[PDB]
């Protein structure tokens, strides 16, 4: 029989998340010549860094039990109506977009468009987002989206320095009306960059000298609308770069800053249907003049042409910044919101918000209350004689107002405000028996409205492009979203075995809580007592992560992997400065590291010294010893990846850490390859002092067409005081007072439920089993493909850790077929191509996660063997190098009905592995060697 | 400027639901030569039946406001833990199925597979459901699903009568252990059929004579497991048909009744992941022996072959029953649940339920409580000395137990029961300080378990087909569901202009509340005080519907259109019997009526008299007068459709009603064409006495691959007392005590939120505008296609109401191309074919709803004109009648890469209207002239 525990099947999610079952795992172990997962892992992972027991995060729970527990936790949050503002407002996300995009795995299970041939649908949505940015800002070049408004302001300052034509100008000016979180992030970035920040009134910049750039907010943090035309003209007369922060919804009604002379315009796209999510993941728009196209940060979608001449979109841009990805899922949400509403719908929403603000202001002023600013769009600043009583009454009414303004309260209206809300506000601020009526006030304000200056009122036409004027029906919008989705190859169709990326399963149980109104719909700057569920969940997650990573503390603020590396380096630098050792600025980086690490080290104000790797990507101790001796007292830290970028479990990592620590240098272990450690080993037990965790890779947070997921960092005890803090929000025991790295205190807090659910559902043994099953899948692919393509960078007994690197260079030499040809030909077999040329050019890195079953691995192996056979045919003279299926891939269905002159058949070209479940690439190969259409 | 009301935009959903905008509507009105919607409608609808004002259901509300109001209503429901049983239990629907199927419009926006070439994906899920039915029941032929277990029992009785080989046997035997709702529905059906029902112990059937069939329940309503092998053998020795009701989850562990000798096995598939939904929409499985294949009710999926010889699935069956459709969406949910769990997972779930029941029973018996039945699977019958105290304690613990058993309480466990629940039950039934421990009881019961007889324990292998053994990963299951979904043509890709079906928009806002746990997860037989939100919502919906239809009362019990017709005819018959006028049994039916009406009239025990239509489908008064005179005192009712089946607003409907009423006959207006009335006219104002409303057609309830949606009926004051009632549930003012027509008191109550949301969001003027816009779209299609294909059955000034009937017979005569060829060729243009040959053979009926925009209508018109040009080419001799794109359609992509011998190009064959957004039919034409593969 079975015990009751076996019948309850706690750990049922372990067998859903891990692809192969017990029999498939046994077959793969037989194929790779290993007795069990424990034996394989113990013969691959070095003995001195092996954990006998996996970190004890708890017993596994079922999806239903975990969801119920998280629902009970989230019910501790209080859903007050928020008028706090400060860059965050409640939105009304259309149910058609929420149903068919946000909760659709075809939209959130894809990664960065490394293959534009299979990503045309999401590329068009990003192009629509760029078109919205161009229309609203009035500039020429728009980015594909940035992390958030504060990071976008930091990038605007960096780009202003890059494009400045003034020597000896190292001062950056910020207007005092800028949102405080933006000011804090800009101050941290300027401290690391060496810039001097001046904060004052906007008009006072003319007094100061040596200013290379200025930051202005179109609408002040307390709601004042500014006309900056004369000041911007005077600034441009002095060759000063002008950047303006603008709200996306306010740009519908207000004059575009680009037409007022702004060089750079950026802001939050959150109000276009993106819920706040306690400061959650939001996209930021970024625009600049055409003369600064070379220095624009981030990625840009461009219009290119096929090998067949068809119009095709691609992500072109790569501008010395550490941004590597964009908030693709949220930017697509904003663009789809714009498409659904149209210019008329967006104008109606903005006019309704402005009219409700005008009605509230007229009522308050009729009842004797004074307003600080006479020009506003959606934010009032009411001067209350008794602030404490007003705040108490608002709390009794379950209404949150901005309470950090001296002798005043702040009300910000949004898309969800109704007349009932305005009546509640009248009751709160004036008391009962005020006697105001919305209709008479409405008639008064519609005729007489002077809250917006005539010059600041928009009069041009926005969103005239046809895509914004033809999908206003729910049926048409649904069909448009489906047509965009059909063009892409997502995880719900095929495996995406990208190296250095963990395209594992984004389970529906992990995705469900992130759309809960208890986790969404929360203002990041709300009083912390109303966010007790978030506090409980984040504390549990931090305890789990410190157990898993072997560290002592965890900070969730960073919202990207590069942001996490930057935050960890900031912690190292602040620790060095706290011991009167600020002269330590040398950051040793192995020659095989990722490109992001030197960028982050340069951002953190660290001199980068490259240490050579002897061979196979293993850094040699003699060169490391010599470099660290040369650094000596000026050695700040080291930046290594374990397992290495070549996916090798090096046997000298402990003595590398010892050598670094011998000279007073910290060890930063990059957590890119953490998917190969969880349960088997931890960076803290290895000896690292600080690391960053890519929850989007190792803990199942999805890539929404890009990878700007959570980047929380784990530190040892001595580095704990120096993790990034926050200024707006103060929470004892969970937030420090250090310079913030993100706009929100906890970054994108509304996707941390994914990691919480994943850890809660797996447990310690589940996580360890997932790691070793991923290792087993990689070794199975390596052992099945060693005779076709040479396997590079093997470990002990010729084994790979979790990535199988295939050597294509000999094949390219004696045939001419490159790794790009194989990557494009895998599309015809129905596969997203692996990573090409990341560690070394001419190679392919295959990283199967634990989530892919043996059937999918066998399909991929069969496709690779068939491609090898095709390369053999190319060598044999059957097909010319000029005309063969490898160089002509991918093949589109328009070719089938045209005249066929190729020496290979249509079936070979288009159905090399069969006709069933055929995915169709929309465009041919993009040479790649920005306007919506 | 704009007023605040214009900025709030109440009625925003009206412009999302209605396809064309104001400019497109003006262009279409110009094309059809009408001044406005009011002018067109007033010139189409006869003056004497026109409503000056639309029925006042209220002002429109936004989607967010309506959702908030419905959430506040649904929060009045109490979510007690239910152990009531009686055929309903809480399920654990896997989040992967809920996310990717239940909330995926690609799964619930399709209709009945009239075109199997575009429905292979859902046909495979229905085939999997049939395979599950065959494996669990042990019989040869399985249906594609029935409405519910009680209706399935009624069909089992009808089929037993059909296949009975005994003359003069008119008695049907029902065992007293059958669920009471099943007994009530069977009694109503037998009263209408003339059968005599005997209810007694199962063994007592041997005493009675003249029995043609017996109904048995494998597990009694109080949980007793029966071994019926000897009794079934003795019954078969007497040529008595044996039907057995079985639970789908109990069949995992218990011996299949088919192997015990049962001729027919049926039951509820609800426990395979389908939430109860207050008795909501559930699928019922139905199986029979191979010798009864001809008399099986409902539809059956069969394995056929293509015109190219490829294997292809199709819905084959049509057995004199009024079932026309199946619960496709719920049956697919059950089949996907079976696929996800596998035989091992299903066995584990059933064994866990049985083990928890055994632990609870052992604890209760150790603590001095007695059990009525020693053999059980998941239901106990605890004999409590103080029933009232136990029930009060259970209510204090928020636990629902079956409370209608004399001197006993009933507990039924399900998939969601845990050890904590069993401990709570111990506290409820034994009090505190009982001292029982789950682990020691578990050890006792695992070793010693006699609650299932050795002969009743299943020992065979179920679900050995490969589809049940290879998709247990979440990734693999997601990819399988996506692969099934990709094969189908749904509303999220193209218009489905089926006549007699209203394939309008199933908005996401209407779909969201049906998955709410407040509306789902409710037991239909829970105490009504815990269902106050349902009561409020249903009362509001009934008031709205009586306003809209011009009637006085509405009953929501019927769960299909045929069920609604049957219920209305039952009301007519009971009214006639209440006035000592039972001899009235003649039901006049026009010769142009649908096929469902005569079936329902025969089911209701009515003699059908056909009255001839003079021409154009308009019934002639002289024949109607003569037929009604001949009927005289025996005339029961009439069954007309307004507008007629040919979509004609007849000008003599008032005098037809007058003629029927002159002889004491009731008027049943079939509500098939109600989409052309709402706001413009109502059947009650016309003069009808009773009608049925297809909420799945006119009020936006989706078709989930089939049309078994709500069929509520509206009646006048005198027929109100005779609407179907319920026996298990008693609610004053909302439920009568008449014979039930469905298992649940309110039918599928968890999809009534769709209709509530639709009406609340549209309002009176919105509904009227939707009706006249649908009329305008039909007239625009008719006016753009009159020169290509003749338009049949025009009204005043040559206008159609809401369906455009195209005459293909001249084209077929002069060319040989049939309406079936055009229907298949429209697939190549990316369209679901219209209705073929419903009113008259050789015609196509196009019904565009108000939801299709002018762009989609223009695309359809262009496709039809291109098809007309192709038929002209066929006539001209360019293409032979044997070899042309019309007769060879649809074209599949496997043809493109094969040798092409056709006289027409590949591009003409496969991309006649372009290459963008190409939907690919999976199979070629199915000739039609049942095993999973």
Q: Token pair of B435, please?
A: 């001292």
E strand spans, A10-129 = 81-83
- In a 3-state reduction of DSSP, which class is residue B243? strand
Q: Token pair of B67, please?
A: 């959702």
Q: How far apart are CA A4 and CA B442, in angstroms?
A: 7
Please determine whether the domains at B342-456 and B551-747 fall in the same fold group of CATH: no
Q: Token pair of B576, please?
A: 């006639």
Element (H, E) at B930: none
Q: Does the beta-carbon distance from A352 to B15 stay under 8 Å?
A: no
Q: Does the beta-carbon distance from B4 to A483 stay under 8 Å?
A: no
- In a 3-state reduction of DSSP, which class is residue B509? helix
Q: How far apart are CA A744 and CA A149, in angstroms?
A: 10
E strand spans, A441-526 = none
Q: Name the minimum distance, in Å, from the CA of A337 to any CA of chain B.
A: 14
Interface of B with A in 428-447 (CB under 8 A): 438-439, 442, 446-447
Q: Does the beta-carbon distance from B482 to A17 stay under 8 Å?
A: no
Bond before A865 cis per omega within 30 degrees: no
Distant-in-sequence, close-in-space partners of B332: CB < 8 Å, separation ≥ 6: B101, B107, B122, B125, B126, B129, B704, B705
Residue A907 contacts B where some CB pair is shorter than 8 Å: yes
Buried b (16+ CB within 10 A) or exposed e, A499-533: bbbbbbbbbbbbbbbbbbebbbbbbbbbebebbeb
Side-chain-side CA neighbours of A718 within 13 Å: the count stands at 12
Nearest to B472 among A15, A64, A851 (CB): A15
Q: How far apart are CA A6 and CA B523, in angstroms?
A: 29
Q: How far apart are CA A691 and CA A641, in angstroms?
A: 10
B693, B564 in Cβ contact below 8 A? yes
Q: How many residues does chain A have?
A: 933
Interface with B, mutate which of A22, A104, A473, A517 (most B CBs under 10 A) = A473
Q: Does the beta-carbon distance from A16 to B482 stay under 8 Å?
A: no
Distant-in-sequence, close-in-space partners of B856: CB < 8 Å, separation ≥ 6: A475, A476, B19, B494, B495
Interface with A, mutate which of B473, B481, B895, B907 (most A CBs under 10 A) = B473
Q: How far is CA A759 from CA A537, B236, B535, in A?
A: 12, 58, 41
Nearest to A4 among B355, B511, B907 (CB): B355
Nearest to A105 among B100, B493, B911 (CB): B100
Residue A8 contacts B where some CB pair is shorter than 8 Å: yes
Q: Which CATH number does A551-760 carry?
A: 3.40.640.10
Nearest to B896 among A9, A16, A897 (CB): A897
For every residue of B753-799, DSSP letters joined together read HHHHHHHHHHHHHHHHHHHHHHHHHHHHHHHHHTTTSPEES--TTS-
Cβ-Cβ contacts under 8 Å, B64 against chain A: 92, 416
Tell me A627's DSSP state: H
Distant-in-sequence, close-in-space partners of A914: CB < 8 Å, separation ≥ 6: none
Interface of B with A in 869-898 (CB under 8 A): 893-894, 896-898
Q: Does the beta-carbon distance from A470 to B855 stay under 8 Å?
A: yes
CB atoms closer than 10 angstroms to residue A602: 18
Q: Kindly list the domain boundaries of chain A, sorted by start residue.
A: 115-341, 551-760
Residue A105 contacts B where some CB pair is shorter than 8 Å: yes
Q: How far is CA A511 from CA A9, A327, A329, B176, B459, in A?
A: 22, 17, 14, 47, 39
Q: How far apart are CA B145 and CA B122, in angstroms?
A: 13
Pairing of strands A211-217, A241-245: parallel
Where does residue B219 rank: exposed (0-12), middle (13-18), buried (19+ CB within 10 A)? buried
Q: How far apart are CA B881 and CA B879, in angstroms?
A: 7
Residue B927 contacts A where some CB pair is shorter than 8 Å: no
Cβ-Cβ contacts under 8 Å, B853 against chain A: 473, 475-476
Side-chain-side CA neighbours of A634 within 13 Å: the count stands at 10
A61, A761 in Cβ contact below 8 A? yes
Q: Which CATH number does B551-747 carry?
A: 3.40.640.10
Tell me A305's DSSP state: E
The A211-217 sheet, strands edge to edge: A141-142, A284-288, A264-268, A241-245, A211-217, A171-175, A196-200
Residue A737 contacts B where some CB pair is shorter than 8 Å: no
Q: How far is CA B173 from CA A495, A714, B243, in A?
A: 57, 72, 10
Residue B23 contacts A where some CB pair is shorter than 8 Å: no
Resolution of the coordinates, Å:
2.3
Residue A238 contacts B where some CB pair is shorter than 8 Å: no
Residue A472 contacts B where some CB pair is shorter than 8 Å: yes
* Domain B342-456: CATH class, spelled out: alpha beta
Residue A22 contacts B where some CB pair is shorter than 8 Å: no
Backbone angles phi, psi at A512, to 5 degrees: -60, -50
Tell me B400's DSSP state: E
Adjacent-strand bridge partners of B714: B554, B691
CA B589 to chain CA centroid, Å, is: 25
Where does residue B806 rank: exposed (0-12), middle (13-18), buried (19+ CB within 10 A)? buried
CA B529 to chain CA centroid, Å, is: 28
Q: Does the beta-carbon distance from B851 to A911 stay under 8 Å?
A: no
Interface contacts (A, B; CB < 8 Å) = 208
Cβ-Cβ contacts under 8 Å, B359 against chain A: 4
For every residue of A572-619, DSSP letters joined together read HHHHHHHTT-TT--EEEEETTS-SHHHHHHHHTT-EEEEE-EEETTEE
A395, A242 in Cβ contact below 8 A? no
Tell me B802's DSSP state: S
Interface with B, mutate which of A1, A6, A7, A446 (most B CBs under 10 A) = A7
Q: How far apart are CA A63 and CA A508, in angstroms?
A: 9
Specify whether the backbone of A865 is left (phi greater than 0), alpha (psi in -120 to 50) or beta.
alpha
Per-residue H/E/C for B112-144: CCCCHHHCHHHHHHHHHHHHHHHHHHCCCEECC
Torsion of Cα atoms, A844 then A850 then A856 then A859, to 10°: 40
Long-range contacts of B232-236, Cβ-Cβ distance < 8 Å, separation of 24 or more: B232/B260, B232/B261, B232/B262, B233/B261, B234/B206, B235/B205, B236/B261, B236/B263
Interface of A with B in 822-861 (CB under 8 A): 851-853, 855-856
Q: Token pair of A352, please?
A: 């309704």
A714, A546 in Cβ contact below 8 A? yes
Q: How far is CA A80 from CA A306, A365, A379, A744, in A?
A: 52, 26, 18, 19
Cβ-Cβ contacts under 8 Å, A918 against chain B: 893, 920
Where does residue A833 rank: exposed (0-12), middle (13-18), buried (19+ CB within 10 A)? buried
The rounded radius of gyration (Å) of the Cα atoms in chain A is: 28
Q: Which CATH number does A115-341 carry?
A: 3.40.640.10
Q: Token pair of B733, please?
A: 């003012």
Q: How far apart are CA A535 and CA A519, in angstroms?
A: 11
Cβ-Cβ contacts under 8 Å, B418 against chain A: 8
Q: Token pair of A448, please?
A: 């007489």
Q: Token pair of A234, please?
A: 């005077």
Per-residue H/E/C for B578-645: HCCCCCCCEEEEECCCCCHHHHHHHHCCCEEEEECEEECCEECHHHHHHHHHHHHHHEEEEEEECCCC
Q: Does the beta-carbon distance from A474 to B16 stay under 8 Å?
A: yes
Q: How far apart are CA B249 and CA B269, in angstroms?
A: 8
Interface of B with A in 189-228 (CB under 8 A): none
Cβ-Cβ contacts under 8 Å, B442 against chain A: 3-4
B140, B289 in Cβ contact below 8 A? yes
Torsion of Cα atoms, B455 then B457 then B458 then B459, to 10°: -70
Q: Token pair of B873, please?
A: 């080419």
Q: How far apart are CA B691 and CA A266, in angstroms?
A: 60
Q: Does the beta-carbon distance from A482 to B106 stay under 8 Å?
A: yes
Q: Does the beta-carbon distance from B348 to A508 stay under 8 Å?
A: no
CB atoms closer than 10 angstroms to residue A233: 12
Residue B508 contacts A where some CB pair is shorter than 8 Å: yes
CB atoms closer than 10 angstroms to residue B664: 17
Q: Token pair of A540, please?
A: 């549990």
Q: Does the beta-carbon distance from B855 to A348 stay under 8 Å?
A: no
Nearest to B475 among A3, A473, A851 (CB): A851
Residue B21 contacts A where some CB pair is shorter than 8 Å: yes
For every residue of A679-737, DSSP letters joined together read TT--HHHHT-SEEE--HHHHT-PPPSSS------EEE-TTTGGGS---SS---TTT--S
Experimental method: cryo-EM
Q: Does the beta-carbon distance from B897 to A906 stay under 8 Å?
A: yes
Interface of A with B in 45-64 (CB under 8 A): 63-64
Nearest residue of B to residue A893, measured between CA atoms = B915
A681, A51 in Cβ contact below 8 A? yes
Where does residue B416 rank: exposed (0-12), middle (13-18), buried (19+ CB within 10 A)? middle
Q: Does the beta-carbon distance from A473 to B348 stay under 8 Å?
A: no
Nearest to B15 among A1, A439, A472 (CB): A472
Q: Name the minimum distance, in Å, from the CA of B912 to any CA of chain A.
A: 11
Q: How far apart are CA A811 and CA B301, in angstroms?
A: 51
Q: Does the beta-carbon distance from A21 to B472 stay under 8 Å?
A: yes
Q: How far is CA B40 from CA B275, B770, B775, in A?
A: 45, 14, 9
């Amino acid at each position: 029989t079975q015990t009751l525990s076996q019948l309850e099947n706690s750990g049922a999610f372990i067998e859903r998340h891990i692809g192969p079952d017990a029999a498939q795992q046994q077959e793969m172990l037989n194929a790779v010549g290993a007795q069990s997962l424990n034996a394989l892992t113990g013969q691959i992972v070095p003995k001195d860094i092996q954990l006998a027991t996996p970190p004890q995060v708890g017993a596994p729970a079922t999806e239903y039990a975990a969801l119920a527990e998280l629902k009970a936790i989230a019910s501790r949050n209080k859903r007050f109506t928020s008028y706090i503002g400060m860059g965050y407002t409640a939105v009304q996300l259309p149910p058609v977009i929420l149903r068919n995009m946000l909760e659709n795995p075809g939209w959130y299970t894809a990664y960065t468009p490394y293959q534009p041939e299979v990503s045309q649908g999401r590329l068009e949505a990003l192009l629509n987002f760029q078109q919205v940015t161009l229309d609203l800002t009035g500039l020429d070049m728009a980015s594909a989206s940035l992390l958030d408004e504060a990071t976008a302001a930091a990038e605007a300052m960096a780009m202003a320095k890059r494009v400045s034509k003034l020597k000896n100008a190292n001062r950056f000016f910020v207007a005092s009306d800028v949102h405080p979180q933006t000011l804090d992030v800009v101050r941290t970035r300027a401290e690391t960059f060496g810039f001097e920040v001046i904060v004052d009134d906007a008009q006072k910049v003319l007094d100061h000298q040596d200013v290379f750039g200025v930051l202005l907010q179109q609408v002040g943090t307390t709601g004042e609308i500014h006309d900056y035309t004369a000041l911007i003209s005077e600034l441009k007369s002095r060759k000063i770069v002008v950047s303006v922060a603008a709200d996306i919804m306010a740009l519908v009604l207000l004059t575009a800053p680009g037409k007022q002379g702004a060089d750079i315009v950026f802001g939050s796209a959150q109000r276009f249907g993106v819920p706040m999510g306690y400061g959650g993941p939001h996209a930021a728009f970024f625009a600049a003049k055409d003369e600064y196209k070379r220095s624009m940060p981030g990625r840009i979608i461009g219009v290119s042409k096929d090998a067949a001449g068809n119009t095709a979109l691609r992500m072109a841009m790569q501008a010395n910044s550490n941004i590597c990805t964009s908030q693709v899922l949220l930017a697509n949400i904003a663009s789809l919101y714009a498409v659904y509403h149209g210019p008329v719908g967006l104008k109606r929403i903005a006019n309704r918000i402005h009219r409700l603000t005008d009605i509230l202001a007229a009522g308050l002023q009729q009842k004797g209350l004074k307003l600080r600013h006479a020009h506003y769009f959606d934010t009032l600043c009411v001067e209350v004689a008794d602030k404490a009583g007003v705040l108490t009454r608002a709390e009794a009414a379950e209404i949150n107002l901005r309470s950090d303004i001296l002798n005043a309260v702040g009300i910000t209206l949004d898309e969800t405000t109704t007349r009932e809300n305005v009546m509640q506000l009248f009751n709160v601020l004036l008391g009962d028996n005020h006697g105001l009526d919305i209709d008479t006030l409405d008639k008064d304000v519609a005729h007489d409205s002077r809250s917006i200056q005539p010059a600041m009122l928009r009069d041009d036409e926005i969103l005239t492009h046809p895509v914004f004027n033809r999908y206003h029906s729910e049926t048409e919008m649904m069909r448009y979203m489906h047509s965009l989705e059909r063009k892409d190859l997502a995880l719900n169709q095929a495996m995406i075995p990208l190296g250095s990326c963990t395209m594992k399963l984004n389970a529906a149980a992990e995705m469900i809580p992130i759309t809960w109104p208890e986790f969404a719909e929360l203002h990041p700057f709300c009083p912390p007592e109303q966010a007790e569920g978030y506090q409980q969940m984040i504390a549990q997650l931090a305890d789990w992560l410190v157990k898993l990573t072997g560290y002592d503390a965890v900070c969730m603020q960073p919202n990207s992997g590069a942001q996490g590396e930057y935050a960890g380096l900031l912690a190292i630098r602040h620790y060095h400065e706290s011991r009167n050792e600020g002269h330590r600025d040398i950051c040793l980086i192995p020659a095989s590291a990722h490109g992001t690490n030197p960028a982050s080290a340069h951002m953190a104000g660290m001199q980068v010294v490259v240490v050579a790797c002897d061979k196979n990507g293993n850094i040699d101790l003699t060169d490391l010893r010599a470099k660290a001796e040369q650094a000596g007292d000026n050695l700040s830290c080291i930046m290594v990846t374990y397992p290495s970028t070549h996916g090798v479990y090096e046997e000298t990592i402990r003595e590398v850490c010892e050598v670094v620590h011998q000279f007073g240098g910290q060890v930063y272990l990059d957590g890119a390859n953490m998917n190969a450690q969880v349960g088997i080993t931890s960076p803290g037990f290895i000896g690292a002092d600080v690391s960053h965790l890519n929850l989007h890779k190792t803990f199942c947070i999805p890539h929404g067409g890009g990878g700007p997921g959570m980047g929380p960092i784990g530190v040892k005890a001595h580095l704990a005081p120096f993790v990034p803090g926050h200024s707006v929000v103060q929470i004892e025991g969970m937030l420090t007072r250090q310079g913030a790295v993100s706009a929100a205190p906890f970054g994108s807090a509304s996707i941390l439920p994914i990691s919480w659910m994943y850890i809660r559902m797996m447990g310690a043994e589940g996580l360890k089993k997932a790691s070793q099953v991923a290792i087993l899948n990689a070794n199975y692919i390596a052992s099945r493909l060693q005779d076709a393509f040479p396997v590079l960078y093997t470990g002990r007994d010729g084994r790979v850790a979790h990535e199988c690197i295939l050597d294509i260079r000999p094949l390219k030499e004696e045939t001419g077929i490159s790794e790009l040809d194989i990557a494009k030909r895998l599309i015809d077999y129905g596969f997203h191509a692996p990573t090409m040329s990341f560690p070394v050019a001419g190679t392919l890195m295959v990283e199967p996660t634990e989530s892919e079953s043996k059937v999918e691995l066998d399909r991929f192996i069969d496709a690779m063997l068939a491609i090898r056979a095709e390369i053999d045919q190319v060598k044999a003279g059957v097909w010319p190098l000029e005309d063969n299926p490898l160089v002509n891939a991918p093949h589109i269905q328009s070719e089938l009905v045209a005249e066929w002159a190729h020496p290979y058949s249509r079936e070979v070209a288009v159905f090399p592995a069969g006709v069933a479940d055929k995915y169709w690439p929309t465009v041919k190969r993009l040479d790649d060697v920005c306007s919506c259409v």
